[PDB]
Design a protein around this ligand. Structure first.
Ligand SMILES: [Gd]
Lengths: 196, 196, 196, 196
């Protein structure tokens, strides 16, 4: 068993680094099951040459809506749960991580099947905030997924490998994703069906 | 479908901007239904020429009170719920947003009807905090609504329009509000009545 | 009705101020009822000549303890609830405020009667954190209440008065407290008795 | 009774200090009962010569896993509860503290017995964040515990003593731990057995 983090706090990732370069989000989002729950996942890279302290991830849903009373909200915002309640939105970013939003009853995607997906007019804004260790200053990094950039029935390729007592990142695989067996029923629809 | 936010994080709002100017709150507050819930809403503008990171909204109620035991608290403070529990108080401020407080059992306005409104001696302090991207420094912006500045039975005019692959803000409409059909019963009173 | 806070964010407190001086906590703590709940309250002053942004209050209990298994924890720490769950620990500090901890089942003082109070070896550490608007830097302010500095059956003198469209603070009254009718039963004991 | 913290905020620890030196975590972790709950505890030192404001502790579990659907997550991360929900993760660090994670149903260690412990391939990353009072800048401090560094059936030696109206820290005892009677059943196993 080779440590990820040494007793003195220095991580064993990217041999010969020195812990402007900019942080990258995966180009696409995926949906698929993880332990019997349907999930939306995107990937968020690290900064090769420094840590980010008080690092956090949050996501917004951008979708125009009409209230039952006829009020039309263009490009209305609602928060997507990505670990807020358990502090899993508080990141230890020292190699790319797959961020996962479990699609449950409170999730905006609860009623959205595979066929239904591409008819929906929506946008996911991902926002990482944190302090660059060296620089001292507070950073923000943003990206966006529209409908056609969400792939149903996919998983992220792993990028991480153990070489010579250090962990190296295959950055070529970063945006790579592969297909996996996945129901085309909406989360809701799955819950209903499982409940009999 | 035209993106709000590009893959590289740059937003498609205010053509030809450069992302001191000061942030503006709407002059008035409104109350009206949204999906069968009574809501208090005020509007909070963006900063045309920069982002605000770790941006957050909170609101206080300023109202003198006497405790059952006779203790008189002048200008006593209590927090108004504006998304604390779901992280919706964590703002992605890149164009003016209507902030909404759902008037539920825990809300200070639960027992306040339309006729009752203007007899009440109270004040809503709105406070936005966040870090100005460029400047580096932590900002605070404050405003205030007293009773006569809360309009019952109103909605905010939309200010947002899509022009030429960019979203532009009609700042003239910012404080503009329009009337809408709205019960004059207090939230409580509505809950009671609906519960039979 | 005279506003506390003007539409432009400037508060109407301390005529002719300019919004090092140090923040003051009340010298004593009090316990007494507020709306049928027993409460521990201390007071925390403002900074006459500047705001504090992202201002927050928290409190620790310092008390040595033995675990059921015989482990002795000298000067063990536990958090005292002072608004954490409702965001009432997030302060709008523009004049001294009475901070209140409701003594409920989860509170360390739940089983502590008046006679029992002075036999207990304990300490309350109060800690205010926040950013000084002008200065730019993050401040911390600390104080401490030991047993003999907690007054059972008392209330804080009000310090706030309206003079000439401005609110002025009588700083002489700051640490002043007065006696009030108050049961000598522990919170627990009160709950039990009320539950029949 | 000798105060820990004086009325003016200055603590009575380390006679003759001046409130780079680096913060130390205990070299080992321990597991044992505290009030009938099984707990994982590690110790985290203070900075002899300055305070840390907005100080916080969080911990991650690093463990590779396969999802029921066959997805393999190398070095997958999940948050370990160390006071998040009660604000006990918000530290008042003015002398070394034993941080405790109660091993409950939601804890990753719930099903892990003593014999089972050393067969498990896992890592605990501890991360303290906070602002150095003097310096002005945001610090992060990290350390790591792998399986062999977690001692089952142990407790931390106390390091704290009262000498001459001041509290002094025996830093020699810092990583010292002693053995204590402790079941070898997993937390789960204990819950089951107690539930009859
Ligand atoms: Gd901060």
């Amino acid at each position: 068993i080779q440590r990820y983090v040494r007793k003195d706090g220095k991580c064993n990732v990217h041999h010969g680094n020195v812990r402007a370069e900019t942080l990258v989000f995966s180009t696409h989002a995926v949906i698929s099951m993880r332990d019997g729950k349907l999930c939306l996942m995107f990937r968020v890279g690290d900064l090769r040459n420094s840590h980010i302290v008080e690092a956090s991830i949050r996501a917004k849903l951008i979708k125009s809506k009409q209230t039952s009373e006829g009020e039309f909200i263009p490009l209305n915002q609602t928060d997507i749960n990505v670990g807020y309640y358990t502090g899993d939105d508080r990141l230890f970013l020292v190699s790319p991580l797959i961020i996962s939003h479990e699609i449950n009853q409170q999730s905006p995607f609860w009623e959205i099947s595979k066929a239904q997906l591409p008819k929906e007019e929506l946008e996911i804004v991902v926002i990482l905030e944190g302090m660059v260790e060296a620089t001292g200053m507070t950073c923000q990094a943003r990206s966006s997924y529209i409908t056609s950039e969400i792939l149903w029935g996919y998983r992220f390729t792993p990028v991480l490998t153990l070489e010579d007592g250090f962990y190296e990142v295959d950055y070529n695989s970063f945006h790579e994703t592969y297909e996996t067996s996945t129901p085309s029923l909406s989360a809701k629809e799955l819950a209903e069906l499982a409940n009999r």
